[PDB]
Subunit: 349 residues, 2 copies
Amino acid sequence: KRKVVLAEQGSFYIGGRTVTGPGKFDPSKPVIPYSNEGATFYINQMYVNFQAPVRPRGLPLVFWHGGGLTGHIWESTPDGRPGFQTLFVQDRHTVYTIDQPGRGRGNIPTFNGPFGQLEEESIVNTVTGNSSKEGAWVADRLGPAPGQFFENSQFPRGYEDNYFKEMGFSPSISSDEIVDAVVKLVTHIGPCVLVTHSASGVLGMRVATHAKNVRGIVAYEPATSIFPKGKVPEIPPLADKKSQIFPPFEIQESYFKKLAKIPIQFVFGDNIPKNPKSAYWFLDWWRVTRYAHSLSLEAINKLGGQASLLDLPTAGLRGNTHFPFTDRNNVQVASLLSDFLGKHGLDQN
Amino acid sequence: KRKVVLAEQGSFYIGGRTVTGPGKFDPSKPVIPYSNEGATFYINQMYVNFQAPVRPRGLPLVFWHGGGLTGHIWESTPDGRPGFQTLFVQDRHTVYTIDQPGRGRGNIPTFNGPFGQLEEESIVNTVTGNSSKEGAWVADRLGPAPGQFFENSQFPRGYEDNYFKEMGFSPSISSDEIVDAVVKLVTHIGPCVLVTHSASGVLGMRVATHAKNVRGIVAYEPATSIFPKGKVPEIPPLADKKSQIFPPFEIQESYFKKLAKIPIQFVFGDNIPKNPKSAYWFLDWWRVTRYAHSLSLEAINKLGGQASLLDLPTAGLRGNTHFPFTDRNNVQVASLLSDFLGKHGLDQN
């Protein structure tokens, strides 16, 4: 189960731009402490890891972590079981895992000065945001409140410390530049499949509208829905009568239509309520967000697409969290991904 | 040359602590935007990757990146050739690579507020520092000035952008907490060998004094010298007669003596001047820093140790930069590391 045979592996940086400080660099002057004088900084580049099996079959898979995460979540589960990287190299696919700009081995754009500031230019905000353990507990639907687990839970209980340690802040890099980095990667790789999660769901949809090399998308619990501009359907507020889900992203119809040309599957785990739940903000958030995605997928299919929503409980898998690919039944989740790829011939040469 | 057979691979988080915001968390209230209210944050944890071969031999190797870097530098060279991770798994060693706290997939401790600040407490400084491309060019001895190469250079020319993109800032996490994370890793792994670089040189020496499981150290161009408390020898200023090298770290003799119990090798590349070089600050810095390390190794040997300085040109390898393990001749550099492991019994069961 753990053995992996690689024809090759490695990593590289791709994407990003440069910004410069004032003046000129003099190599006779003290270089330390570091200065912005005469400086060139590489910013917003992306880290990419790849593992290729011997005799690959089908298209490479690009695994794209959710918000505040890194490629670690595809390497191993919190309790040390194989992640999707190993499972899909074993399934004969070349596997790319990324750390997007602003996360993990991706660039965090900061310089000599207050965080994110290059002289008088604010590349990213000095004030950061970051979820707590408690916020992530309910966001990820481990249970309705911190410390509590749903009855059917597939979370690897006992490995909470490992799990929450993988999470962190993201600087305010523009989503345009994150999309740009992945478009460049997709151009480098050739035809491929994007496998996204949470915050990278909407970003992967955007990449596909800019890159015909994206031949399929599987999105695990995407966080933001996407619609043609001016055609966002009515979406109710949350049960607290005041909150709303993430504002839907709107793109021109010419680009939206490109989503109708490839197979797209959204995958949802368990314990999303069917009815309003005003006592549990993030459970109710997930209810309305999943509803918005169902309308997004319908809009794609009305344009002739091949978009589907897979609720893991309807496939016989109970208790999955927001991270089905690291839950205890991740091998079964993986088999469903393999089924998707096989159905559309994305596992054939 | 690229094929790798892994009995297992994966990654995990280790070390770190928690800090807490004020108040309590209520799951009925809006969780986004994120707040420090009722918040627990995991901070200063470390990311660890491992690859184990079939039939391992000897001790596992822990590769520890230099300042502003990540485990990428052991995975691949900037031009995409195998890094030491692959080479040593092929040599039948289990290979660990880390992203230390504050770098890459390690934690960057920031919250909801100005960078590094949790309410009134500064966990890390809001003002960052970061080398420029120009500063790194001369620090790494690609050449004497930005954009210029030494004639003999082993740098993979043409891949400068890829190379500099791997570098970034580090928040002001205490070195004590970085050392603590690796001590905890070494406790978990058992007997092992540390392979360090630049800024992690002094940190690896400190880990060895706190961890008997460290059975050997190979340090590529360590940046800070270490001496027993009160016994720092005379070290000259730089050729400009104003600048100094990094202040040597001083440790109690009782701990320093532990360095005499294991084999230690410092490895230096090429183009470090023998004579004062006032026109080129970082070339002169390397001259005096290398001299300080020669005194540090001598102090270890006067306590009965086995501490050596390997200048790669004396082994017939010319032109190496500050990253010998990603230079064009990194297979030959690796061979010298395997020679060290074999001589000292570290590649036998």
